[PDB]
Structure formats: C-alpha cells, structure tokens
Curated annotation (Swiss-Prot), chains A, B:
GO cellular component, one term: plasma membrane
Sequence ranges assigned to domain IMD in this UniProt record: 1-219
Protein name stated in the entry: BAR/IMD domain-containing adapter protein 2-like 2
Localization (cell): Cell membrane; Cell junction; Cytoplasmic vesicle membrane
Domain of life, source organism: Eukaryota
Effect of residue 108 to A: Impairs lipid-binding activity and hence PtdIns(4,5)P2 clustering
Main location: membrane
Gene source species: Mus musculus
Tissue: Expressed in the epithelial layer of the intestine and in the kidney.
Range within the parent protein: 2 to 220 of 522
Length: 219, 219
C-alpha cells in the first residue's frame, strides 16, 4: 500500500514533468526559434546590400584603364557571397520547415495526448485501488465472521493486488519511456540540423579554398 | 596644344573621381559594413538565447531516470554552438578591426591627399604651359626681328614641348596608379577577410564532424 502510492506519485511526477516543463519549453523554443530566423533573414539582407555595393565598385574598376583585374576580383567576391547565402538559406529552411513548423503544429496535439495518457492512468489506478481495498474489507469481515468462503475471498484479493503491482509497475515504465521519447525527438531534430549545417560548411569551405587562390594577385 | 588639354582634363577627371565617386562609395561601404556587423551580433544573440534553452532541457533530461544520455547530448549541442559562435565572432572582429576601421581613416586622410595631388598637378601643368608660351613668344619675336638666333630658340621650344609631353604622360600614369592602388586596397582587405573566414570554416568543420558522429551513435 505504501509502496504503491510511491509508484503512483513517481508516475505522476513524470506526466507532470512532460506537461508543465517539457511541453511549454517546446512552445518557448518555437518562440526563440522564430526570433533566430528573423535575425538570420536580417543578416542575409545586410550582406546582400553590402556585397551589392562591392559589386558596383567592382563594375567601375572593370570600366577603368588599369584596374580591370581588380575589377574582376571584386565582382566575383560579391558573386561568391551570393552563393554562400543561397547555400545557407537551405540550412535556415531546414530549421524552419523541418523543425519549427513541426513543433508548433504538434505541440498541443502532443500535450493533449499525454493529458489523455495521464488521465487514463489516474482513473485506472483509482478503480483498482477502490475495488481492491473494498475486497479487503469483505475478506476482513467475513474473516471474524468465521466464514468458510473466506478462502475464495483471500485469493480474489491476492490476485487483485498482484494485478495492481503489475499495472502500476508497467505504467511507470511506460511513462518513463514517453518522457525519453520526447527528449530523443528533440535531440534527433537537432542532429538533422547539425548535419545540414555541417554540409554547408564543406561546400563553403570548398569554394573558398580556391577563391582565395584565384584572388591572389601574384606569386 | 589642345590635345595636351585633353590629357589635362583626364588626369584631373581621375583625381576628381577618386575624390567624388570612390571615396563616398567607401563611406557608404563603411556604413553597410557596420549595419552588417550589427545584424551579426543580433543573430549571435538570438542563437545564444535559443541554445541556452536547449541546454536547460538537456539539464532537465540529465535529472530524469532514463534520459541522461540524451540530456548530455543536448547540452553538448549548446556547448558546441557556443564554441562555434565564439570562434566566429573572432573572424567578425577582423572585419571591423582590419577592414572597416582602416577604411574609415583612409576615406578621411585620403580626401586631403587627393586635394593636394590635384593642386600639385594643376600648379605644375600651368607652370610648364606658361613657360612654353613664354619661349614661343620669344621665338616669334626673334622671327620678327630677323634674329639669327631663332634657330636655337625653335630648337629649345622643341625640347620644351617634348619635356611637356613626358610630364603629361607621367602625371597621367601616376593618376591611374593612384586610382588602382585604391581598388587594390579594397581587394587585398577582403581577400584577408576571406582567408580568416576560411580558417574558421575548417575549425568549425573539424569540431562539428566529430560531435555529429558521436551524437548519431548515442541517440
């Protein structure tokens, strides 16, 4: 009995961690996440305006009489930045489409899921608890009543308590699992982001290893 | 002779362009430079806040019964973003310090230099043009007086006209050299920025590709 309100409490602490700790944190990450995107979109703009202006300076040098080659270099620096940005707004779109639209689209759908799960558990615990402790009393009083049929009632109670041990034990494991599944999903989505961004790193590094060589002006 | 005039107007057109076109383009470039810097430090701040939250979640998983490994990963993911941001803000300060600040002064000290080079050329052109007229005048006078020595005056005028052709060619090649030095500065600075950013791309790849393999196996 004492050990069982323990399971009950421990299982409840987990559903409550999910509902009022984890779930809200996902709304938050969608909030902070959207701010993150807007900063990204602002950086890419400031870059495009900056390099568009380098392109113009470059276009002037192309027109000149001795700075044609320097002219070519500046124009292809802006072109490069334009490319790296195309590459980067891919990672930014993975972040948006694959991660940020996912959480806001499902966050309440999964709140309600765990809410029903938690309710199902509580309600079944209450019943077993009730049907059990009442059977104990039947046994408890057809006990002093020196009833012969107290033996079928002793086994009816003992199996009822075994089933509750099973259920309570299984619920705690299933609730732990759900918690882990949600951490794992957060970790996995961020692993995909880390991976796309790693890919961008290799591409950008790819073109800069040669650009830096082509833009030297001698030796 | 007015083809020497056409040299004169081009040699001035070059100095005046550096001063009236190029340098106000660089001042604009400094502004867009700092706007760019501004959007980066904001992205940094957004990303920083976002992954500070990711890490909190990791710290909550670190205190669960079965999600400690996933929680360690999430925290390792924040620590990684933080390291990368730190490493990149370093490249960004190269931008501000090695480029933007240096342009600032160049676009200030330069205007005085170009003013002094225009004036200097104007003074030297006119002194040579005046002395040429003065010798042509002395020639035509001898030619009136039937002076036998106009033979050694026309010879001199020829020498002077020649030295004037040389001065007019040199001064223009010197103007074109000045205009090109300034494009060269723009290009050298951004090549340096490019190499600094390339070194970072390597460091970022190196650190991230290792983490991603681990995270993949652990989750």
């Amino acid at each position: 009995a004492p050990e069982m309100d323990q399971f009950y409490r421990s299982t409840m602490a987990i559903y409550k961690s999910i509902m009022e700790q984890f779930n809200p944190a996902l709304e938050n990450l969608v909030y902070l996440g959207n701010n993150y995107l807007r900063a990204f979109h602002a950086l890419s703009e400031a870059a495009e305006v900056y390099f568009s202006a380098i392109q113009k300076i470059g276009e002037q040098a192309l027109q000149s009489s001795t700075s044609q080659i320097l002219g070519e270099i500046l124009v292809q620096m802006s072109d490069t930045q334009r490319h790296l940005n195309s590459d980067l707004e891919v990672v930014v779109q993975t972040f948006h489409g694959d991660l940020l639209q996912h959480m806001e689209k499902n966050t309440k759908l999964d709140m309600q899921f765990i809410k029903d799960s938690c309710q199902h558990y509580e309600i079944e615990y209450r019943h077993r608890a009730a049907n059990l402790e009442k059977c104990m009393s039947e046994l408890w009083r057809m006990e002093r009543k020196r009833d012969k049929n107290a033996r079928e009632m002793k086994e009816s109670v003992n199996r009822l308590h075994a089933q509750m041990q099973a259920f309570v034990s299984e619920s705690k494991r299933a609730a732990e699992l759900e918690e882990k599944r949600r951490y794992r999903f957060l970790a996995e989505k961020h692993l995909l982001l880390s991976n796309t961004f790693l890919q961008f790193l290799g591409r950008a590094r790819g073109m800069l290893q040669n650009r830096v060589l082509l833009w030297k002006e001698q030796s």
